Coordinates of C-alpha atoms and ligand atoms in Angstrom, one line a residue:
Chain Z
X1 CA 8.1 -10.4 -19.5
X2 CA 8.5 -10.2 -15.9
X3 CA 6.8 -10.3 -12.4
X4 CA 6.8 -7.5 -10.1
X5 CA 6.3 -7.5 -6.1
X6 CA 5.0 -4.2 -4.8
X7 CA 4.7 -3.1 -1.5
X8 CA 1.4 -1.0 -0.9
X9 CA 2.4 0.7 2.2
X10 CA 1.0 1.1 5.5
X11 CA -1.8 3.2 5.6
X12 CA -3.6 4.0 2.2
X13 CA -3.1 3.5 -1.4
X14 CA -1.1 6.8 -1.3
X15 CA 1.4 4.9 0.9
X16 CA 2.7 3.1 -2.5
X17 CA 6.1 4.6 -4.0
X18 CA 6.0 6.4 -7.5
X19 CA 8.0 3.9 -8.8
X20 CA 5.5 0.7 -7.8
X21 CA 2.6 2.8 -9.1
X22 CA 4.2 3.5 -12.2
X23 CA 5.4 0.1 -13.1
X24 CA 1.8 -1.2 -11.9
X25 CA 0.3 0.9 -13.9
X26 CA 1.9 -0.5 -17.4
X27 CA 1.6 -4.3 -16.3
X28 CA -0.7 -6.6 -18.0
X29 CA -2.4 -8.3 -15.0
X30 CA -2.1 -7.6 -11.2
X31 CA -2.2 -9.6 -8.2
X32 CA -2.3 -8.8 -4.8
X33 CA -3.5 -10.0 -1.6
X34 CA -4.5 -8.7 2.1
X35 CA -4.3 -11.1 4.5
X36 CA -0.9 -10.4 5.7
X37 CA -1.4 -7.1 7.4
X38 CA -4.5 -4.5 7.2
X39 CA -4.4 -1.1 5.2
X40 CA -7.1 0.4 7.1
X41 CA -7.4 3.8 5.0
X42 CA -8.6 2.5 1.7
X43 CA -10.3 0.1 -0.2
X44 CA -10.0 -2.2 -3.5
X45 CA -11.5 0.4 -5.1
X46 CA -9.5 3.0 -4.6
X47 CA -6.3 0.7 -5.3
X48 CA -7.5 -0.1 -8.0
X49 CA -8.7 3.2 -9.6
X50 CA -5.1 4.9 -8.2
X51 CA -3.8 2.0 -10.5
X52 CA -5.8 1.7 -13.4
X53 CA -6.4 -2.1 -13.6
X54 CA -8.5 -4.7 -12.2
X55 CA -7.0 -6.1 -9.4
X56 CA -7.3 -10.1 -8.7
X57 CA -7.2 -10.9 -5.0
X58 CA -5.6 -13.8 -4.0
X59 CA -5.9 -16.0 -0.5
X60 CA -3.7 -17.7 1.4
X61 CA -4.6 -20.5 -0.1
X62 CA -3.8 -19.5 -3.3
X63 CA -0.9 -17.9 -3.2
X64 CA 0.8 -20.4 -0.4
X65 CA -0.5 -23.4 -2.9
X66 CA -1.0 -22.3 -6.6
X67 CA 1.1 -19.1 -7.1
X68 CA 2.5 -21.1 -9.7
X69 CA -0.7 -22.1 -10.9
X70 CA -2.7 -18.7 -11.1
X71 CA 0.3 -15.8 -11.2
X72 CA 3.6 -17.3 -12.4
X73 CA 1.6 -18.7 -15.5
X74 CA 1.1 -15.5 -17.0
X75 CA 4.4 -14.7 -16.4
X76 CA 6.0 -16.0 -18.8
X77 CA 4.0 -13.9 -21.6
X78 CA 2.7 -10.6 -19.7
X79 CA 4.3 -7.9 -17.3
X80 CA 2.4 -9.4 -13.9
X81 CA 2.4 -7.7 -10.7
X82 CA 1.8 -9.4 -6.8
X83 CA 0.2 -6.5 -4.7
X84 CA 0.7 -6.7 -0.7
X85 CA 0.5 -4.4 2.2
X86 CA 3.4 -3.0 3.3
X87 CA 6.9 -4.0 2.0
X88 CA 5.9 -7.0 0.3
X89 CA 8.8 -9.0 2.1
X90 CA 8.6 -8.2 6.1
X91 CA 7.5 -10.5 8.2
X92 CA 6.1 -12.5 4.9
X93 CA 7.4 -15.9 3.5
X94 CA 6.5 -13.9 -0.1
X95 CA 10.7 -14.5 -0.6
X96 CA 10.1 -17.8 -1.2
X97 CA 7.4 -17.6 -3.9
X98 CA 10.9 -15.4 -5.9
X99 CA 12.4 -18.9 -6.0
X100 CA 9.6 -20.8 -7.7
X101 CA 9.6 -17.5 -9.8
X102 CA 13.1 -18.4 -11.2
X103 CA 12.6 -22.1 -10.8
X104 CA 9.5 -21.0 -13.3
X105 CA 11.8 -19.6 -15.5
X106 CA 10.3 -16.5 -14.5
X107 CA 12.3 -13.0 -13.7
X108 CA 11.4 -10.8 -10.5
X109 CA 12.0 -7.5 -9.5
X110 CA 11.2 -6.1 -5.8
X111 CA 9.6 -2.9 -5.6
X112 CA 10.0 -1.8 -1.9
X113 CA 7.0 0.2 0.6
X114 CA 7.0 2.1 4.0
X115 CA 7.3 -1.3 6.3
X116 CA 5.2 -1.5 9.9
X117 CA 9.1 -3.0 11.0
X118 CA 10.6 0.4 10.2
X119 CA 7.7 2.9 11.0
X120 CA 8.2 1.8 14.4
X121 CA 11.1 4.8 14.5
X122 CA 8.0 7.3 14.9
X123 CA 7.8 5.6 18.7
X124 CA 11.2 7.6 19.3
X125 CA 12.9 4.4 19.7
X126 CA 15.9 4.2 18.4
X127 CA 15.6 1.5 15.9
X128 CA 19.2 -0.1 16.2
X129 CA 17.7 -0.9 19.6
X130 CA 15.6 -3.6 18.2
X131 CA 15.7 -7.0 19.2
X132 CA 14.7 -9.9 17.8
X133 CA 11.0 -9.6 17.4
X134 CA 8.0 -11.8 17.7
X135 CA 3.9 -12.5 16.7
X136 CA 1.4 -12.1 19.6
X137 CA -0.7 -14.6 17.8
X138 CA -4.1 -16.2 18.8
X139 CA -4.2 -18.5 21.2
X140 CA -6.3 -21.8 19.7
X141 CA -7.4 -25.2 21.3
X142 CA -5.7 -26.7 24.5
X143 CA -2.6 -24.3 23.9
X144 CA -1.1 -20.9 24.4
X145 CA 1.9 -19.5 22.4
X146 CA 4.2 -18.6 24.8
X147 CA 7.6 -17.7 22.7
X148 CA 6.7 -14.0 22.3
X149 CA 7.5 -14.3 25.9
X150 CA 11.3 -15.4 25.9
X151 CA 11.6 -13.3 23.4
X152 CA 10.7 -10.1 25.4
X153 CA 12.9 -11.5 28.0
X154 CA 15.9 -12.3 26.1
X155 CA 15.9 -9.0 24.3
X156 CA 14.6 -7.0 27.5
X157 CA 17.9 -8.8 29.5
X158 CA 20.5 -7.4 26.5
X159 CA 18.5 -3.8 27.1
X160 CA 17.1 -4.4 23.6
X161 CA 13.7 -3.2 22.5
X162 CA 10.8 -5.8 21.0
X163 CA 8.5 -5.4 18.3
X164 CA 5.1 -7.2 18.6
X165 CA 3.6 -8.1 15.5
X166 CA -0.1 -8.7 16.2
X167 CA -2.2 -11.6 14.7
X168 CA -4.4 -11.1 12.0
X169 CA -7.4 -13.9 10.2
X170 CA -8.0 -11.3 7.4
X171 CA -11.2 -13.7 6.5
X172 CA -12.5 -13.8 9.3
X173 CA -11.5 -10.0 9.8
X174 CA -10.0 -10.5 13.1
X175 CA -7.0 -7.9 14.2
X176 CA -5.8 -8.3 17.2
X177 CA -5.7 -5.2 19.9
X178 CA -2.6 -4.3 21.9
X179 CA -5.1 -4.7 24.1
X180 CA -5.5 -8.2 23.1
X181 CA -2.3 -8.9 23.1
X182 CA -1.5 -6.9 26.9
X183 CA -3.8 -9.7 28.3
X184 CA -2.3 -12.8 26.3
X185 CA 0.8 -11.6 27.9
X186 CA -0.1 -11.0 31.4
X187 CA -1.5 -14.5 31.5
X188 CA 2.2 -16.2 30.2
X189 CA 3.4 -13.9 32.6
X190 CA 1.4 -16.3 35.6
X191 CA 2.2 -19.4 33.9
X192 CA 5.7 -18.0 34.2
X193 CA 6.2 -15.4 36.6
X194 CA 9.3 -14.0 34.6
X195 CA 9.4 -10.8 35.7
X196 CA 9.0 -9.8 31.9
X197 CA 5.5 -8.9 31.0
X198 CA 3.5 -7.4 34.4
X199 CA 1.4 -4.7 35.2
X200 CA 4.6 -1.9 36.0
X201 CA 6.5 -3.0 32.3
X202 CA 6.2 -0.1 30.2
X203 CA 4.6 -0.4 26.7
X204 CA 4.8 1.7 23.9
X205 CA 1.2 1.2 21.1
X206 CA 1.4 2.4 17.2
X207 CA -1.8 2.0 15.8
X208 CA -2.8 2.9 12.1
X209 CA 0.7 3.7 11.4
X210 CA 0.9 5.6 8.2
X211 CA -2.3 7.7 8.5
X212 CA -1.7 11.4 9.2
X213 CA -2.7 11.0 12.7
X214 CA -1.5 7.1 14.2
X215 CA -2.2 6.4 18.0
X216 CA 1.1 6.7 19.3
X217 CA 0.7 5.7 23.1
X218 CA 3.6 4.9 25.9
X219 CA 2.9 3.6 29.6
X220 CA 2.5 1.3 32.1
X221 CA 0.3 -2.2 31.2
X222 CA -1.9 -1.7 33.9
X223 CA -3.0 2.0 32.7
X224 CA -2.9 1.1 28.8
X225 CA -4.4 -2.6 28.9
X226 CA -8.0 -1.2 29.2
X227 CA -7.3 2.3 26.5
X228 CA -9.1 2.4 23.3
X229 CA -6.2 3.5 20.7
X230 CA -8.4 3.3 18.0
X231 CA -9.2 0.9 14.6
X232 CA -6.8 -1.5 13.8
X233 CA -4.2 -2.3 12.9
X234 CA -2.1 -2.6 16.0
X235 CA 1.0 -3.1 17.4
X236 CA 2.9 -3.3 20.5
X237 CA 6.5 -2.6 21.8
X238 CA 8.1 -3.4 24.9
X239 CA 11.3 -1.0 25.5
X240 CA 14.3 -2.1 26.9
X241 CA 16.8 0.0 29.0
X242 CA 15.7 3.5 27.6
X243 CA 18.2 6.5 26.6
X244 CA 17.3 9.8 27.7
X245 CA 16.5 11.2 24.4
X246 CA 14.1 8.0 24.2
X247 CA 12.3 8.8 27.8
X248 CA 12.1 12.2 26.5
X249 CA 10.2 11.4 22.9
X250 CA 7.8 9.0 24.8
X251 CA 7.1 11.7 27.4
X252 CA 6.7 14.6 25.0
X253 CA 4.9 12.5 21.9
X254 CA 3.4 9.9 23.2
X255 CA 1.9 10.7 26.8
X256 CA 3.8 8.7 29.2
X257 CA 4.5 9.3 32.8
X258 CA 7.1 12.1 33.3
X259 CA 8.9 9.6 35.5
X260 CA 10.2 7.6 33.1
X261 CA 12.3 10.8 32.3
X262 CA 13.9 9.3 35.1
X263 CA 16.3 6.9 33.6
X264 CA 18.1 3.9 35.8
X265 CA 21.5 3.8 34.6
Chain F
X1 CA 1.2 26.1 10.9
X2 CA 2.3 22.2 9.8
X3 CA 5.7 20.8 9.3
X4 CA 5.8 17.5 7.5
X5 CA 8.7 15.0 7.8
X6 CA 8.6 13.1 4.2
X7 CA 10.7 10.2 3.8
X8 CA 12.9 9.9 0.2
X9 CA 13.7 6.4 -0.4
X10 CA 15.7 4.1 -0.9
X11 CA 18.2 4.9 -4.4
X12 CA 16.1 7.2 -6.5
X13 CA 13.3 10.2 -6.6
X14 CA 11.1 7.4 -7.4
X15 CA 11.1 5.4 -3.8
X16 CA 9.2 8.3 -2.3
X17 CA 5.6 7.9 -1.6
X18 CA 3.0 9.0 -4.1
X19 CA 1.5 10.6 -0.5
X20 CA 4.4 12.1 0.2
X21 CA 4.7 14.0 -3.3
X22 CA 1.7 15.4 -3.3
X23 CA 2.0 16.7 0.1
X24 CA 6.1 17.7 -1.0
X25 CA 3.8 19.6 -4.0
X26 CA 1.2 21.4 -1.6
X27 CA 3.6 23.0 0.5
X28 CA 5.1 26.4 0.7
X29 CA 8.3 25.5 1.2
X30 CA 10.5 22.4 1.1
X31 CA 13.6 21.6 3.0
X32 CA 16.1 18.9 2.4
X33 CA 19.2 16.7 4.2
X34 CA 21.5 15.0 2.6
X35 CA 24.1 13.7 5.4
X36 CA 22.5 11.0 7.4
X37 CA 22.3 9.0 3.7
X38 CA 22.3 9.6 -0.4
X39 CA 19.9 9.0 -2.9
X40 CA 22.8 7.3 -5.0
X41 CA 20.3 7.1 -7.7
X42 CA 19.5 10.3 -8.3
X43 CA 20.3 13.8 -8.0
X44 CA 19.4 17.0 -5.6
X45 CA 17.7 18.4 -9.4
X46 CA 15.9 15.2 -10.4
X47 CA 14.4 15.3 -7.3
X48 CA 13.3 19.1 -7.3
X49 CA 11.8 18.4 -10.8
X50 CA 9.5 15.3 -9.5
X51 CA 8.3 18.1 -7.0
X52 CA 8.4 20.9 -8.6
X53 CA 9.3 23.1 -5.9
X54 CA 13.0 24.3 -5.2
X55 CA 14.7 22.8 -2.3
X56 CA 17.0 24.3 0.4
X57 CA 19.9 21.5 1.5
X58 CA 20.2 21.4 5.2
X59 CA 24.0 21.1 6.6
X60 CA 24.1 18.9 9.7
X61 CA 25.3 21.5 11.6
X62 CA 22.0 23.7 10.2
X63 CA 19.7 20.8 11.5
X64 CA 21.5 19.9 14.6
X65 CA 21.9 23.2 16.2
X66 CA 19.6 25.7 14.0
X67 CA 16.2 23.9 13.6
X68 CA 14.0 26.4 15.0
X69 CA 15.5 29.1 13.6
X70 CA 15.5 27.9 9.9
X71 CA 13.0 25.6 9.5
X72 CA 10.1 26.0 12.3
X73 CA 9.9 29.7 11.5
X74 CA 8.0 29.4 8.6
X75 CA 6.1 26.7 10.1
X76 CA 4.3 28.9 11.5
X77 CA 2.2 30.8 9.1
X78 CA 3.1 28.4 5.9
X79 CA 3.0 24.7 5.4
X80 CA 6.6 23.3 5.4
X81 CA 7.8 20.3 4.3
X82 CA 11.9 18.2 5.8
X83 CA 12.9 15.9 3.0
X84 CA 15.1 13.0 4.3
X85 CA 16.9 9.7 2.7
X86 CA 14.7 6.5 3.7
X87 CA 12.4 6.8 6.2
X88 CA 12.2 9.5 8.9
X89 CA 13.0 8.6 12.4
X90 CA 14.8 5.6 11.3
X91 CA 18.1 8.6 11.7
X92 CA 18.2 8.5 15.4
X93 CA 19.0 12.4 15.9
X94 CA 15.7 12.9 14.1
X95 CA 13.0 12.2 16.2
X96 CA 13.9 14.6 18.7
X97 CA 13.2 17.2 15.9
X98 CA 9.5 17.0 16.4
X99 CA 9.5 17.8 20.0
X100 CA 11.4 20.7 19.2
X101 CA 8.4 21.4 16.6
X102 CA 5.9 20.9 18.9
X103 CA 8.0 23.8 21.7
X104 CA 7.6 26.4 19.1
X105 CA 4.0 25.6 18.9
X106 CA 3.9 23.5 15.5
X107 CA 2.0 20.4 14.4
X108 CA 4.2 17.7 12.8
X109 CA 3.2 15.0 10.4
X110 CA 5.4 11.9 9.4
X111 CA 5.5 10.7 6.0
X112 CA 6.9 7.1 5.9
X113 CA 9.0 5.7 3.1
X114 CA 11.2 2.4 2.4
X115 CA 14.3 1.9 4.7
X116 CA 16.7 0.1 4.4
X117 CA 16.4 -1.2 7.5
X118 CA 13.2 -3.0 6.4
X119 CA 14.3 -3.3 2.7
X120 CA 17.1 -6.2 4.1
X121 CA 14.2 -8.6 3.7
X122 CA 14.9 -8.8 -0.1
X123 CA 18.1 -11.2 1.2
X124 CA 15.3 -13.5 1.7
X125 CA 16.1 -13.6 5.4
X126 CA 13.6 -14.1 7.7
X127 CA 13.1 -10.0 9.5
X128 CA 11.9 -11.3 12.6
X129 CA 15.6 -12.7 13.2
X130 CA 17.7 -9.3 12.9
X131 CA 18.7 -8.4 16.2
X132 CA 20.3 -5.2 17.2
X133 CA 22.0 -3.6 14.8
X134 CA 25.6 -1.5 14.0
X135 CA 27.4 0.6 12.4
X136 CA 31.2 0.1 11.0
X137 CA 32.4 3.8 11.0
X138 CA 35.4 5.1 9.4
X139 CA 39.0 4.5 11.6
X140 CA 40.3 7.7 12.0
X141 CA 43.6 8.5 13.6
X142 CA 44.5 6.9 17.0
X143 CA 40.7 5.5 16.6
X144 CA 39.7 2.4 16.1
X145 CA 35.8 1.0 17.2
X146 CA 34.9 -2.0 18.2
X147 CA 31.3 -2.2 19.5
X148 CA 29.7 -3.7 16.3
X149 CA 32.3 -6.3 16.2
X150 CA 30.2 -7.0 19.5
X151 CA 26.9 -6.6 18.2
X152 CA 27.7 -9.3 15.8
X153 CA 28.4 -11.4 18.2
X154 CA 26.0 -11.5 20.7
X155 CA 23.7 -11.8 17.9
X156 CA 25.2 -14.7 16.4
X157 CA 25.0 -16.2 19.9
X158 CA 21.0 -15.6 19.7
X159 CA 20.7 -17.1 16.6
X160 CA 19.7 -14.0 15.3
X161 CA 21.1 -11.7 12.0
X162 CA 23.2 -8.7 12.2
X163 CA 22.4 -5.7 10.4
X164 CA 25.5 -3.7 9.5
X165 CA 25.3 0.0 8.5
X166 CA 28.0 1.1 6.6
X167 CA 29.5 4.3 6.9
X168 CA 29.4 7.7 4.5
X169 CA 31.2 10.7 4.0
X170 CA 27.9 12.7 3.0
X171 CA 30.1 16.1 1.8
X172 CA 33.0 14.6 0.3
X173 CA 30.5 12.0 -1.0
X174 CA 32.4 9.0 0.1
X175 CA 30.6 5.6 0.4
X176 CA 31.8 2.9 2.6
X177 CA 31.7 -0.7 0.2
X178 CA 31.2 -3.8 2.0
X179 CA 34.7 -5.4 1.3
X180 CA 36.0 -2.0 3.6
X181 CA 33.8 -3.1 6.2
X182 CA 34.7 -7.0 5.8
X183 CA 38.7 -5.9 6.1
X184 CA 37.6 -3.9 9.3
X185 CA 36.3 -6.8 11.3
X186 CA 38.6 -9.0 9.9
X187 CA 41.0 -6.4 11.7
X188 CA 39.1 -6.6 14.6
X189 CA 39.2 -10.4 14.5
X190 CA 42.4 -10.8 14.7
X191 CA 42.4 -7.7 17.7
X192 CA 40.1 -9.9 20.0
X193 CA 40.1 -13.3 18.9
X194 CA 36.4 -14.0 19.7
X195 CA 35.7 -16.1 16.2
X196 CA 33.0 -13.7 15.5
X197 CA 33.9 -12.7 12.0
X198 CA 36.7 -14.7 10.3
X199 CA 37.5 -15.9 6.5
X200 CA 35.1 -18.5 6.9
X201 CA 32.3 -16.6 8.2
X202 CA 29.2 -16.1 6.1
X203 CA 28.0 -12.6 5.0
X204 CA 25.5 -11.3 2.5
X205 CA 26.2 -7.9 1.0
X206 CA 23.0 -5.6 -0.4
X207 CA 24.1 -2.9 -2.6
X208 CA 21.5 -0.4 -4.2
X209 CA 18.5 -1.6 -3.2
X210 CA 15.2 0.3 -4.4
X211 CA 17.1 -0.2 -7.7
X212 CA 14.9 -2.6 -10.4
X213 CA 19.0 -3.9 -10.2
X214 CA 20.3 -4.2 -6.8
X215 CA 23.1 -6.5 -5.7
X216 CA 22.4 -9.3 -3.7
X217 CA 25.9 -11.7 -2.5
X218 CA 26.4 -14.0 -0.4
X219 CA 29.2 -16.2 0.8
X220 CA 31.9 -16.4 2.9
X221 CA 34.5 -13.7 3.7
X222 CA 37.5 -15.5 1.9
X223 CA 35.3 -15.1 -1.7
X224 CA 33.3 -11.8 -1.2
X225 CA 36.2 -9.7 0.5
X226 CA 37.6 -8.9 -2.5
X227 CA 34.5 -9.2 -5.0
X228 CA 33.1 -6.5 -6.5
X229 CA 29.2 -5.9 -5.5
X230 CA 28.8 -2.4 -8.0
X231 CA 28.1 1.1 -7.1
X232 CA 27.2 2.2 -3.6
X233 CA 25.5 2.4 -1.3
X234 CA 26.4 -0.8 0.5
X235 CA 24.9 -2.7 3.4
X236 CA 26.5 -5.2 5.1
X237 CA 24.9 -8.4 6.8
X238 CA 26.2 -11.4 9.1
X239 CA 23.4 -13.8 9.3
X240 CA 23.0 -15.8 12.3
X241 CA 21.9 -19.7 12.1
X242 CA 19.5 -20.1 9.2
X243 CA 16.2 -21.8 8.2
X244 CA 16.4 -23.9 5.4
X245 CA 14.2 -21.7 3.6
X246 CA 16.5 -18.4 4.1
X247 CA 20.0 -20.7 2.8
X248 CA 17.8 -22.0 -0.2
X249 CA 17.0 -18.3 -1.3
X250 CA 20.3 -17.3 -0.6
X251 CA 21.4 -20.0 -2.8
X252 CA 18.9 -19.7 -5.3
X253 CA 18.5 -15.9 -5.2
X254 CA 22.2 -14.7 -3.9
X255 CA 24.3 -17.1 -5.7
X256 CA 25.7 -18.4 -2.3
X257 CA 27.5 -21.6 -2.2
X258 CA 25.6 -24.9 -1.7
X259 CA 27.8 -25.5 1.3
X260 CA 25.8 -22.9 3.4
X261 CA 22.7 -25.6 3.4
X262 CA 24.6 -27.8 4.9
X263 CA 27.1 -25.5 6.9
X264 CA 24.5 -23.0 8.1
X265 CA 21.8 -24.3 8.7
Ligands
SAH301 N1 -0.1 0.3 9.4 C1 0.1 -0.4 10.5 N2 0.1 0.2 11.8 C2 0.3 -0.5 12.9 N3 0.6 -1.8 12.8 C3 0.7 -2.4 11.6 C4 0.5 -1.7 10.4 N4 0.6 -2.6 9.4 C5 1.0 -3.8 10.0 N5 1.0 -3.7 11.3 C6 1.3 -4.8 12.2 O1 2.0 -5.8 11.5 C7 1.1 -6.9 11.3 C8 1.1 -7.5 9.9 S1 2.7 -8.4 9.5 C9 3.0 -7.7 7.9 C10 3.8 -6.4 7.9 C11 3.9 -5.8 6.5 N6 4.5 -6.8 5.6 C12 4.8 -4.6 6.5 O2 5.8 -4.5 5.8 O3 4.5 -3.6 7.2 C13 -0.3 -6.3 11.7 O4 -1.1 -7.4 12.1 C14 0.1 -5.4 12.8 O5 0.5 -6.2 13.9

């Protein structure tokens, strides 16, 4: 009698690990939701018939306010199973709902899935390179995010590279572009004039990571910000300093300007 | 005419994806490293009887210096496939492999898989806060490094979390355990006298994780130096000032003291 997170992975249903389909395949009832990231190569169907159950799907709502109610419940007498995209806890706050788990009584087990945070290594970027890392996220009312920015800045000033996580309203199947996100930087790049974010800053794009054949696209913002890399979902990088070996990836993988080759030491 | 770089796991033959087993399956021949990490929860013939297909173990050296003479060959007229430990690309030296793939005229996929590097969110730290990351290799002789002790520390000053790779010995199959790497920057504490890691500092340790049973610690130095987190492989982690939510799991989850929601937060 336990309850099981599994990561989905990236891309497809495929992208799950042997071990999370085997253990979803012998639980009782399974969970899952898909607002926090997109899997754009599949569909609950397919999930679900890789599986072999019915799958209940679960909103923010929901999960963020009865997890308790509607998952931990059954719990305590079945073999239940949360689905997610991804790696179940990246850039989540699914690690709390493992402490009403136990404060449930309930055990939980963590079955881990290729996570957007670590497929960003098929950029060429080395991944100890990577910053802190921040959400591009929509800008609503009377007020733009602007943090995203320092961010960029602080890492970009240590030589650090930053991981962008896009926004995404899963209900109102919104998912943000880099393209999207290019612009809502440029603009806190005015209300700042940083030197961070401008039209010479060199960007690195992953879209669809996980499918055979992602959009993997390096250049400057002013060439890039009007590209069509393809469906969602996105996400953008801003390099720091690069190493040769970086320069050379970018160049040779992902179509960027053979100047960058160029390094400034 | 395809190579295909498919991504292990985490501890067992289990933590690879059910995407990249059936691509591991379809190919003509299958390739294999074992030095930039270990599946410590499983062996070289578990694994080659989940595919069932032989596998030829790459040295280093063979990789490094011999890629496109062992491997890319039959690239050409077959479908090969590069097993690695985690996720590909998240080994620095390997991303350069596919440019040499792409010089001897050969497409190259990526097959993703759970790293460790994303995995670290099961410490119920928050991911968006893990800044750049290390490495505590082995002294040896007149050498002693000193860089991560560093990385800790202008981390620390961000606010943000310090991943710690520990070192291996992949050959003579020596893993590096966290209290090693504690006793190291405890030596280097006491060799620069910056306050970044001392007996009071707080650390979590993650041993085994991909297991249904990994170890998750955390506390200060003075308690977990000498405690013993299980079999390898170990990761090591200095957290940098935490939410309320991250100390709570950490309590809850990690057995850490109560102190830390007071101390750390
Ligand atoms: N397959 C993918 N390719 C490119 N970007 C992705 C992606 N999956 C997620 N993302 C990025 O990450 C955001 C969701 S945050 C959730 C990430 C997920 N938990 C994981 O472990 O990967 C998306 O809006 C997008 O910005």
């Amino acid at each position: 009698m336990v309850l099981y997170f599994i990561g989905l992975g990236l891309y497809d249903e495929r992208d799950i690990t042997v071990k999370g389909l085997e253990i979803a395949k012998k639980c009782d009832y399974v969970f899952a939701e898909f607002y926090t990231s997109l899997m754009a190569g599949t569909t609950l169907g397919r999930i679900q018939k890789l599986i072999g159950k019915e799958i209940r799907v679960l909103s923010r709502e929901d999960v963020e306010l009865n997890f308790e109610n509607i998952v931990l419940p059954l719990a305590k007498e079945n073999d239940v199973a949360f689905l997610t995209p991804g790696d179940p806890l990246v850039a989540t706050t699914h690690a709390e709902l493992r402490i009403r788990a136990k404060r449930a009584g309930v055990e939980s087990y963590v079955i881990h899935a290729p996570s957007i945070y670590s497929a960003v290594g098929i950029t060429g970027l080395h991944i100890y390179k990577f910053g802190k890392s921040a959400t591009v996220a929509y800008p609503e009312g009377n007020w733009f995010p602007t943090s995203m920015y320092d961010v960029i800045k602080e890492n970009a000033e240590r030589g650090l590279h930053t991981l962008l996580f896009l926004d995404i309203k899963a209900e109102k199947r919104m998912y943000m572009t880099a393209n999207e996100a290019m612009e809502l930087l440029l603009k806190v790049e005015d209300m700042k004039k940083g030197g961070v974010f401008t039209d010479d800053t060199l960007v690195v794009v992953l879209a669809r990571a996980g499918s055979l054949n992602p959009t993997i696209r390096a250049g400057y913002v002013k060439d890039l910000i009007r590209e069509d890399f393809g469906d969602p979902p996105h996400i953008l990088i801003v390099p720091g300093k690069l190493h040769i070996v970086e320069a050379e990836y970018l160049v040779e993988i992902a179509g960027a300007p053979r100047e960058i080759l160029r390094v400034n030491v």
